[PDB]
């Protein structure tokens, strides 16, 4: 019965909370959709009363002086509709309106494919981590860190796994927005509503947002669409507007995801909204030898096993495809009931998984340029 | 005619033409064979259930190249007979030139040689035909077994078979059947062959056909009565608990 | 039915590993499928359930579900819990002559 | 008054020479125009990759003419309701006409500019009315200096014969492929804040580049210092600018076989 | 997909750049040309315990004084039997002598790589340029032993010591310090088998590999299974005496 006795001190403090309400007691009783108050009784020009709603739409040309002495009446005055700025009396302005935002904390992902990502992750570190360490080298040399970056390749073979792993070491705000749900219906639901997230990115610093599912946003057109994809294409152009006139690159990052690099609008892929591109392909053999180690760090393996002959059975592959070999190898200890992971389990798994199980249904010829 | 090529080389080496050319044998009937000392035995089956025909009136896998060489395989039907007639003309081509019968080694190369132009040159698509080639050499009683892949890859074998679930059936002959110690009596090769034929077709022995290749231009095709003689011996000591 | 073209946009290497395809049952599997369906079923003791199992073309548990119901409704018209032998072959034909059709590919 | 001026742009002096006779001149002296009855247009049309022009170009015109800068994006014109942005057409012109001289800019015209002739134009009826209200009202809203209509985008895939008039869009500007001396003047803009060793030859680097617009030329100067980041150099050199080409943009990276 | 005439962003064909993946799927082979003879060898491995290695030829002979090998699909290995072997006899048909290994390789490369979409005079009908890595070695009447290779891309280069196959990445790395100008024939016989031991996934066997040599007198001579087993026993006695 904690909540039972918690209200004992809270109801007594509710009057203390009401003491702040005692400033304005009129009209009965900071994120806002549109700025709305009741009559704004408090308030050249002295008092300032503006409201936008179905009744009594107000507008004032002047401002920037103290009528209200900070908050007044309905407490909501500030940025809405754009066009409207009350700044001088401690504004609750540029605040997220009613919308759908996905905000999580600590997207913890460990290392997946280090085989070809040795110097490839360093390019990702030069995006976010670089301005957070030695910003003085940017003003002296005259160079700026990359903002936009593109991810292309097979669907999450250790490419996407690396994208979520580096973001965990950034220690900043992580927000995931996709492109599939972005369509919706109303014009502006996929652009103006997301523009509020882009406008807040300049307000709240230390924010990192990964743009997802760009195939549902961009893409090349010939007949200029069959209809219904115009807003899909206008959202592509709305992303350009935030990068068009002005934008800081310090606290704002741009990263895409797709299966092929050039499937977007060839004008969209033009540089300046993408400074660098992530080239993701099948790395060499000895480079992926650390992948077999990472999965075996927490895995009990018989001492004396030789990984040299195991890697020979496996041709060029990715990080996730190597875990599938150990995944079925873990199933070899289920049915056949092996104590630990042996060499015969790994040598057979490559022929069991890649040769035996995998067979068809893989991405091979589906990426050239386009 | 068609100037381009009907095949495209693969980035990783996975070629659409190589893909479904092997599964053409997986869709078709199995061809079972085993070598021997003085002879070689080649068995087979049939996919059709209801049989209104006779074995003699309708040929299936039965084909002949040299007098003592009987060549039986299943990769396909129509594309399979094209390589047979070209091999018979080639077999005659050695009689029009070398005057002597060609060895089994080149008979495998010629079948893969035509398949070589399919995978290499354009204007014509490859087949799904995979031939198990057998027979003897002139003045030689030692048989040969060559597994011809549609990509032009061949190798020497003994108990190898191709067809539906033939990789598992061959595992039965990887232990009990010893390649270092081949059997002597001709009927000994049939005892191990019939036991391997019951793992696929099971009942419906009318579809089971056995073709024994013998030297001096002799071919013996076993009937359904002689096959049932070895079926009883399978359940004799197997059902008894020692 | 066929996920082939559908598969490698989704499955990914190692999130979901399963492959299960429809297999033609052998002599042993067909006995366990048809024999267990008859556990609660009653029929003529002079008819063997394995008679039609020897020679048959691709009849799975779905094909047997109708052959039990079709033959059951014919015997239920006379109000009897047992089904005669004539309804066994009559129910197999109309199921084999409708959904079951091959590609007419022989030999090979 | 933005920092972008005629010195911060290059290669557009051919179009700017024709732009002054469109916007700048009638803004001040109307004497020579009224004698010949020539009504100058309120703007022009341009398309191409940014960094060479467009955005930075349109903003530079507001600094030279010293007028109010009013910018409204094209995808923001189309709305979810009926004529929500189309009603703002006369609204945008009424504010521009009454208060101060200004130049209205359109960002990414393709947003309201993807139609062509097909039958899907009935999907959004507010788009075409916005364009037709724009063209027919230029004569009624004319006779002042305080309203100027300017549009820009990345590429124009829609050819409209009705956009050609003395009062309508005059210039169709396609960014040409910059030549040797043209790419040199563009690189001089982004190298003003760069610290070099004075070993660089401008005509030497432009010959190795082919069909690289200012958007791609800007990435060369930015990625040049990143090569010296791992080397610990105090300033970029002539080789570092060549290493900017070695950076992966156009697929200049290495491979196997014929070279190793 | 699209037309074969499509190049890479560097201006190269796709089938040429992608021809290196079919080599790793083949057999690992390392040729070496020493001062005495030229060491040739391949790896048969096994596809099954019942596989017979007697009738399979992964090492061919174009002419007596030269030799050849293959790593890859066996289809293109027979294309040079009607081309490289024919050109070697064509040389004896005209100039009646041993063709130079330096000239033969470039002469074979003319008959080796021909392809495209289509052409009337020349035959471009071949789709894949090469599916196999062919080795070219022999003895020159002027210079001496020359070890060359036919690449799946179609080019040719002078190789003092060449390593092909899937294990060519780890074998050629150590091969730099292993190959010397003082390396003789007998010293190179146990050197190849020692390198192939780290390559081969199974136990060294007479049926799992095939080796040969090129002699300036006797010519190309294969190592019989009885002779190959002798080199295997000499390797086990040599490795035990290294420490």
From Swiss-Prot, chain A:
Recorded superkingdom: Eukaryota
GO cellular component: cytoplasm; nucleus; proteasome complex; proteasome regulatory particle, base subcomplex
Family annotation (Gene3D superfamilies): 1.10.8.60, Nucleic acid-binding proteins, P-loop containing nucleotide triphosphate hydrolases
Keywords per UniProt: ATP-binding, Cytoplasm, Nucleotide-binding, Nucleus, Phosphoprotein, Proteasome
Disulphide linkage map: none
Main localization, broad class: cytoplasm
Binding site for ATP: 153-160
Biological process terms in GO annotation: positive regulation of protein catabolic process; positive regulation of RNA polymerase II transcription preinitiation complex assembly; proteasome regulatory particle assembly; proteasome-mediated ubiquitin-dependent protein catabolic process; ubiquitin-dependent protein catabolic process
Cell compartment(s), UniProt: Cytoplasm; Nucleus
GO MF, any single term: ubiquitin protein ligase binding
Modifications made to the protein after synthesis: The N-terminus is blocked.
Positions bearing Phosphoserine: 67, 134
Quaternary data: Interacts with UBR1 and CIC1.
Record's function text: The 26S proteasome is involved in the ATP-dependent degradation of ubiquitinated proteins. The regulatory (or ATPase) complex confers ATP dependency and substrate specificity to the 26S complex.
Miscellaneous remark of the record: Present with 105 molecules/cell in log phase SD medium.
Family stated for the protein in its record: Belongs to the AAA ATPase family.
Record protein name field: 26S proteasome regulatory subunit 7 homolog
The species this protein was found in: Saccharomyces cerevisiae (strain ATCC 204508 / S288c) (Baker's yeast)
Lineage of origin: Eukaryota, Fungi, Dikarya, Ascomycota, Saccharomycotina
Swiss-Prot record, chain B:
Keyword Phosphoprotein assigned: yes
Positions with biased composition (Basic and acidic residues): 235-242
Matching SMART domains: Proteasome_A_N
Keyword Membrane on entry: no
Keywords of this entry: Cytoplasm, Nucleus, Phosphoprotein, Proteasome
Record SUPFAM superfamilies: N-terminal nucleophile aminohydrolases (Ntn hydrolases)
Compartments reported by the entry: Cytoplasm; Nucleus
UniProt modified residues of type Phosphothreonine: 58
GO cellular component, one term: nuclear outer membrane-endoplasmic reticulum membrane network
One GO process term, biological-process aspect: proteasomal ubiquitin-independent protein catabolic process
InterPro entries, alphabetized: Ntn_hydrolases_N, Proteasome_alpha, Proteasome_alpha-type, Proteasome_asu_N, Proteasome_bsu_CS, Proteasome_sua/b
Assembly, per entry: The 26S proteasome consists of a 20S proteasome core and two 19S regulatory subunits. The 20S proteasome core is composed of 28 subunits that are arranged in four stacked rings, resulting in a barrel-shaped structure. The two end rings are each formed by seven alpha subunits, and the two central rings are each formed by seven beta subunits. The catalytic chamber with the active sites is on the inside of the barrel. Interacts with CIC1.
Miscellaneous: Present with 16800 molecules/cell in log phase SD medium.
Name of the protein: Proteasome subunit alpha type-4
Origin organism lineage: Eukaryota, Fungi, Dikarya, Ascomycota, Saccharomycotina
Swiss-Prot record, chain C:
Cell compartment(s), UniProt: Cytoplasm; Nucleus
Entry function: The 26S proteasome is involved in the ATP-dependent degradation of ubiquitinated proteins. The regulatory (or ATPase) complex confers ATP dependency and substrate specificity to the 26S complex. Has ATPase activity.
Protein family per UniProt: Belongs to the AAA ATPase family.
Protein name, entry field: 26S proteasome regulatory subunit 4 homolog
The organism of origin for this protein: Saccharomyces cerevisiae (strain ATCC 204508 / S288c)
UniProtKB/Swiss-Prot annotation, chain D:
Modifications made to the protein after synthesis: N-acetylated by NAT1.
Gene: RPT5
Role: The 26S proteasome is involved in the ATP-dependent degradation of ubiquitinated proteins. The regulatory (or ATPase) complex confers ATP dependency and substrate specificity to the 26S complex.
Keyword Nucleus: yes
Superkingdom to which the source organism belongs: Eukaryota
Binding site for ATP: 48-55
Localization per record: Cytoplasm; Nucleus
One GO CC term, this protein: proteasome regulatory particle, base subcomplex
Record protein name field: 26S proteasome regulatory subunit 6A
GO molecular function, one term: proteasome-activating activity
GO BP annotation list: positive regulation of RNA polymerase II transcription preinitiation complex assembly; proteasome regulatory particle assembly; proteasome-mediated ubiquitin-dependent protein catabolic process; ubiquitin-dependent protein catabolic process
Family: Belongs to the AAA ATPase family.
């Amino acid at each position: 019965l904690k909540q039972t006795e918690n209200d004992l001190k809270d109801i007594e403090a509710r009057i203390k909370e009401k003491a702040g309400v005692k400033e304005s007691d009129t009209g009965l009783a900071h994120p806002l959709q549109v700025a709305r108050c009741t009559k704004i009784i408090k308030g050249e020009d002295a008092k300032y009363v503006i409201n936008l709603k179905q009744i009594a739409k107000f507008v004032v040309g002047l401002g920037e002086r103290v009528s209200p002495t900070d908050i007044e009446e309905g407490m909501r005055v500030g940025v809405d509709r754009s066009k409207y700025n009350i700044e001088l009396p401690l504004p609750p302005r540029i605040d997220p309106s009613v919308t759908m935002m996905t905000v999580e904390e600590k997207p913890d992902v460990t290392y997946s494919d280090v085989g070809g990502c040795k110097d490839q992750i360093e390019k990702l570190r030069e995006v976010v981590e670089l301005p957070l360490l030695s910003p003085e080298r940017f003003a002296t040399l005259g160079i700026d860190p990359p903002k936009g970056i593109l991810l292309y390749g097979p669907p999450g073979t250790g490419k996407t796994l690396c994208a979520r792993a580096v973001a965990n070491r950034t220690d900043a705000t992580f927000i995931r927005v996709i492109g599939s749900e972005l369509v919706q219906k109303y014009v502006g639901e996929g652009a103006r509503m997301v523009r509020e997230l882009f406008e807040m990115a300049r307000t709240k610093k230390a924010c990192i947002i990964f743009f997802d599912e760009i195939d549902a946003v961009g893409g090349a057109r010939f007949d200029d669409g069959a209809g219904g994809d115009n807003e899909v294409q206008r959202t592509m152009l709305e992303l350009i507007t935030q990068l068009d006139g002005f934008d800081p690159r310090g606290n704002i990052k741009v990263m895409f995801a797709t299966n092929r690099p050039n499937t977007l609008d060839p004008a969209l892929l033009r540089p300046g909204r993408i400074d660098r591109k992530v080239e993701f392909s099948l790395p060499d053999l000895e480079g992926r030898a650390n992948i077999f180690r990472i999965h075996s760090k927490s895995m009990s393996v018989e001492r004396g096993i030789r990984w040299e002959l195991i890697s020979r059975l496996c041709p060029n592959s990715t990080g996730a495809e190597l875990r599938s070999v150990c995944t079925e190898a873990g199933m070899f200890a289920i049915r056949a009931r092996r104590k630990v992971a042996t060499e015969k389990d790994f040598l057979k798994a490559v022929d069991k998984v890649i040769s035996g199980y995998k067979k068809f249904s893989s991405t091979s010829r589906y990426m050239q340029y386009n | 005619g068609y100037d381009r090529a009907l095949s495209i080389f693969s980035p990783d080496g996975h070629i659409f033409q190589v893909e479904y050319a092997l599964e053409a044998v997986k869709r078709g009937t199995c061809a079972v064979g085993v070598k021997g000392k003085n002879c070689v035995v080649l068995g087979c089956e049939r996919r059709s259930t209801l049989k209104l025909q006779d074995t003699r009136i309708t040929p299936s896998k039965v084909s002949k190249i040299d007098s003592h060489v009987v060549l039986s395989f299943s990769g396909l039907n129509a594309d399979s007979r094209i390589l047979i007639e070209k091999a018979r003309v080639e077999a005659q081509s050695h009689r029009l030139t070398l005057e002597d019968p060609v060895t089994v080694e080149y008979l495998t190369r010629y079948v893969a040689g035509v398949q070589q132009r399919y995978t290499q040159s354009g204007g014509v698509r490859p087949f799904g035909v995979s031939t198990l080639i057998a027979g003897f050499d002139p003045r030689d009683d030692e048989p040969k077994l060559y597994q011809t892949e549609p990509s032009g890859i061949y190798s020497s074998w003994s108990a190898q078979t191709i067809g539906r679930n033939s990789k598992t059936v061959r595992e039965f002959l990887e232990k009990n059947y010893d390649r270092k110690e081949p059997p002597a009596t001709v009927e000994e090769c049939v005892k191990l062959t019939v036991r391997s034929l019951l793992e696929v077709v099971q009942t419906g022995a009318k579809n089971i056909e056995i073709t024994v290749v013998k030297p001096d231009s002799d071919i013996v095709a076993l009937s359904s009565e002689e096959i049932n003689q070895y079926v009883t011996q399978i359940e004799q000591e197997k059902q008894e608990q020692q | 039915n066929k996920i082939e073209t559908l598969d490698p946009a989704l499955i990914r290497p190692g999130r979901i590993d399963r492959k299960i395809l429809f297999e033609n049952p052998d002599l042993s599997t067909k006995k366990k499928i048809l024999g267990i369906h008859t556990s609660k079923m009653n029929l003529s003791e002079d008819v063997n359930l394995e008679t039609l199992v020897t020679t048959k073309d691709d009849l799975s548990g779905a094909d047997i579900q109708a052959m039990c119901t079709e033959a059951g409704l014919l015997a239920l018209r006379e109000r009897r819990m047992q089904v005669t032998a004539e309804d066994f072959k009559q129910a197999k034909e109309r199921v084999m002559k409708n959904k079951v059709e091959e590609n007419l590919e022989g030999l090979y | 008054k933005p920092t972008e001026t005629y010195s911060d742009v290059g290669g557009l002096d051919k179009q700017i020479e024709e732009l002054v006779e469109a916007i700048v001149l009638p803004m001040k002296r109307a004497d020579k125009f009224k004698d010949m009855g020539i009504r100058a247009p309120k703007g022009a049309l341009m398309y191409g990759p940014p960094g060479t022009g467009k955005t930075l170009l349109a903003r530079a015109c507001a600094a030279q003419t010293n007028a109010t800068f009013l910018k409204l994006a094209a995808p923001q014109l189309v709305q979810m309701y009926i004529g929500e942005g189309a009603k703002l057409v006369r609204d945008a012109f009424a504010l521009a006409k009454e208060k101060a001289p200004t130049i209205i800019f359109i960002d990414e015209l393709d947003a309201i500019g993807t139609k062509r002739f097909d039958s899907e134009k009935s999907g959004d009826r507010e788009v075409q009315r916005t364009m037709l209200e724009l063209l027919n009202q230029l004569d009624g809203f004319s006779s002042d200096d305080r309203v100027k209509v300017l549009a820009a985008t990345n590429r124009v895939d829609v050819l409209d014969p009705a956009l050609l008039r003395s009062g309508r869009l005059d210039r169709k500007i396609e960014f040409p492929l910059p030549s040797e001396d043209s790419r040199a003047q563009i690189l001089q803009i982004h190298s003003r804040k760069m610290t070099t060793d004075d070993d660089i030859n401008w005509q030497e680097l432009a010959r190795s580049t082919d069909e690289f617009n200012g958007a791609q030329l800007k990435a060369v100067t930015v990625e040049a210092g990143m090569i010296a980041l791992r080397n610990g150099q105090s300033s970029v050199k002539h080789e570092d600018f060549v290493e900017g080409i070695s950076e992966v943009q156009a697929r200049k990276s290495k491979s196997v076989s014929f070279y190793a | 997909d699209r037309g074969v005439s499509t190049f890479s962003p560097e201006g190269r064909l796709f089938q040429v750049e992608y021809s290196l993946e079919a080599i790793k799927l083949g057999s690992t082979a390392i040729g070496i040309a020493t001062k005495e003879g030229v060491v040739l060898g391949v790896e048969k491995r096994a596809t099954s315990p019942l596989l017979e290695s007697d009738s399979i030829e992964k090492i061919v002979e174009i002419d007596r004084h030269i030799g050849c090998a293959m790593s890859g699909l066996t289809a293109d290995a027979r294309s040079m039997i009607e081309h490289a072997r024919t050109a070697a006899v064509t040389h004896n048909l005209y100039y009646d002598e041993d063709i130079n290994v330096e000239s033969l390789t470039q002469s074979v490369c003319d008959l080796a790589l021909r392809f495209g979409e289509g052409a009337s005079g020349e035959e471009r009908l071949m789709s894949r340029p090469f599916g196999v890595a062919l080795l070219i070695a022999g003895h020159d009447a002027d210079d001496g032993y020359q070890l060359f290779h036919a690449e799946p891309s179609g080019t040719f280069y002078r190789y003092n010591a060449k390593a092909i196959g899937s294990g060519s990445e780890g074998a050629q790395a150590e091969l730099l310090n292993e190959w010397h100008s003082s390396l003789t024939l007998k010293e190179a016989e146990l050197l190849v088998l020692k390198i192939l031991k780290q390559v081969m996934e199974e136990k060294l066997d007479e049926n799992n590999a095939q080796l040969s040599c090129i002699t300036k007198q006797d010519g190309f001579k294969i190592y019989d299974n009885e002779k190959t087993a002798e080199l295997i026993k000499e390797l086990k006695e040599k490795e035990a005496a290294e420490s």
